[PDB]
Amino acid sequence: ECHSVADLRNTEPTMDGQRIILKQHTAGTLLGGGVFRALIDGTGKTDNNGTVIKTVGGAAWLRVNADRVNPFMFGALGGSNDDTIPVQSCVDSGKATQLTDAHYVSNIQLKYNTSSIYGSGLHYSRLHQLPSATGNCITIKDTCSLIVLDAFGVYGTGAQQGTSFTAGTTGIYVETPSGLSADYPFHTTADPRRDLCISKVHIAGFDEYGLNIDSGNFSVTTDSLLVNHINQVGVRCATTDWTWTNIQVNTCGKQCLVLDGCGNGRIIGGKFIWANWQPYGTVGQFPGITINNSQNMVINGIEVQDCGGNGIEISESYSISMNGLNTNRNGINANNTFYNIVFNKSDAVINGFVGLNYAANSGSGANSSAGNFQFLSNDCSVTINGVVETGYMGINFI
Amino acid sequence: ECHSVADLRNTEPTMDGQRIILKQHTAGTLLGGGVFRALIDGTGKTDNNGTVIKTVGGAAWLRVNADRVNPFMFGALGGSNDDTIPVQSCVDSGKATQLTDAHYVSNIQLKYNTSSIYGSGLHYSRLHQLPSATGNCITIKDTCSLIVLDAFGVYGTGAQQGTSFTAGTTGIYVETPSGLSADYPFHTTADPRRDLCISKVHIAGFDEYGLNIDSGNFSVTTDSLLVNHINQVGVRCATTDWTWTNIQVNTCGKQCLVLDGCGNGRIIGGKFIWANWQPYGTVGQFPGITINNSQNMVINGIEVQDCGGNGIEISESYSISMNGLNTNRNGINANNTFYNIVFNKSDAVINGFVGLNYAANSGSGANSSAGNFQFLSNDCSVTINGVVETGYMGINFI
Ligand SMILES: [Cl-]
């Protein structure tokens, strides 16, 4: 067998379709091996360092691999190695990537409609940003549509509970599109239609944002996204026309969620807890959720609980519709100070509201919200329906 | 080729990285074979009977297998064979498991963040509990977090329509956590943060419970869970802080769903039909859904229909919010006797209620609910809005 791709490049096939065995990609590693088939005439093909290897006399060895690629095929070593380049080659390869293990990277870009990534769990199959890297661990570029990101973790320096972060990092960024193509869904140039699903992905341990979807991107679907341990903002969205189902964000130093300039969004099933988490040392108050400058939002079946300051702050927003909403036991950083929903120059229709303050119910004495609603201005038009005061006994008269 | 792993254990390599072909795991079967590679220095590697095989001389043979394991790698035979140990070895292996076929098991435990399981369908790829086994077919242990269970069946004795059950069986049990770790998500000891996803899993044919999530577990997500043919209770949950989407439970001898001591839960999209199923012979009335001793629940877009007794019984519960609810044509075991929603010492806000009783509409004469609402106590605080009486013609004056 050939002992490495370096030797494969020095091995000329003598017959078309010739089978060769590659022991491993890189000498002494036993990783990334496989069977390859030769094309004597290799014009048209480009060496990519893992599934198309070209020889000195211009043949192409083709890896026999019907479906997805994995970083080991392109030279990844796992462990403490920097696997950025092999991961980047996978997503650029022309096929979906499967993550089979944990791989350190610095920054990765998804560019094509083939740049899907699949794992097998929210922890063990993962990309992990190297400690000295800054910026976005994964960026979805405006040329990338119709992909799936499914069942893997995106972890940063602070991923483990109670640990410190690398400044200036983001887990997944969706960049603002710079143009509009006219050949969707076959486009290869900038286009606003992301039309992609992020499903069962776990983001943890970044500084600025877990997930940050910038303005101008349509139909970024999330489903069962799980974000935790973010030094600042768990999830930011600044765009229009999307649906998220079953989002969960937990333990953020500032907001769990920022909606800023959003429109025509749906959130269906969500849990935002432990925002403004005091050990993360953020200076100042931030709510569990900011809804700012937004409009035509439908937010159903969410909960905001155990946040250090206000629950939900709705500001300068029109036509916010919420149906089934649980906010309780926020204001945890100073007792009897903060409120579960704060309205400022906004209009909202809230139905199915509940909010049993479990600290008042148990009589624990733990810090909790002074009450459910605060109006910071008198020009809001708001309706609220539901169980505004729960009706438990009141062991501590509150 | 080596004829069996037993032979492989008696085959010393004489060159590091040496390739060997294994025809099959166990003699005669033609299953579980593949290519392996030698480590002459075996130490620090443990025989696991499918992917790491140690020789009498201390070398390790390592299966060439980048991604998921399957039970056939570890000696499973399929068909009528008890594959419990092969399947247990997979979920213990350090990688996710793929089920490629139906395997009989007695009882499996999921213990690690690597213990994911994937199939390719809600039926053909499955675990099937042996008629000789009792207890939990799958137990998720309190050390197991961040896994995915996706697209496979979990079947017991009664899975086929109209068949009998083995006493004392449960499909999937999530045990009560015995401790709290301080290094999530990298924990290896008990923790309440399950943070896992059960997606497109079909549970059928168990005695006591299809799915039973015990108290103290956070964020067990379910997505497109299908439970049917359960002798007693389709799904029981007794915990807090979770979301389920598109749950369907069909044909249970007692309740389709028990929420007992739940809080801060969301169910979005659900159908619970044919509870208190008379052929399963249970003694007594059980509702489609029991909500007992619960609080701060948001339950949107569900349907309870065709159940033998009451539709939904809400008892000793605070702050139950329901937005979009369909209950009709329950009480099928005795005409004109049972009610679609029964309130007992509970508070609730129900919006977007509908309940066209299709049997009264068609004039079939089939047994159905006496009416939509019954109050067993007068200390309830309840708001109900929607279409309380549908307004069809009334062929039989009802
Ligand atoms: Cl909804």
Author numbering:
A (entry chain B), B (entry chain A): 266 to 663
Manuscript text:
Herein, we describe the crystal structure of full-length TSP2, which reveals a small head domain formed by a D1 fold module, lacks the D2 fold module, and its N-terminal 168 amino acids corresponding to the interaction region of TSP4 are structurally disordered. The TSP2 structure was refined at 1.9 Å resolution. The crystal asymmetric unit contains two homotrimers, providing two independent views of the biological trimer. For both trimers, 168 N-terminal amino acids have no associated electron density; thus, these were not modeled. The TSP2 trimer assembles into a 160 Å elongated structure with a shape common to other TSP glycosidases, distinguished by having a head-like region, neck, and an elongated body. The structured region comprising amino acids 169–921 can be broadly divided into the two canonical tailspike domains; the N-terminal head domain (residues 169–244, or ~ 8% of the entire 921-residue TSP2 polypeptide chain) and the C-terminal body domain (residues 256–921, or ~ 72% of the entire TSP2 polypeptide chain), which are connected by a 12-residue α-helical “neck”. Unlike TSP1 and TSP3, both TSP2 and TSP4 contain an additional fold module preceding D3 (designated D3′), which adopts an open face β-sandwich fold comprising an antiparallel 4-stranded β-sheet with β-strand topology 1 2 4 3 warped around a 2-turn α-helix. For TSP2, the structure suggests that the active site is also located within an intermolecular cleft, with Asp506 and Asp571 positioned 6.4 Å apart, and oriented appropriately to form the acid/base catalytic machinery. Replacements of the two aspartic acids by alanine residues abolished the halo formation, thus confirming that Asp506 and Asp571 comprise the catalytic machinery.
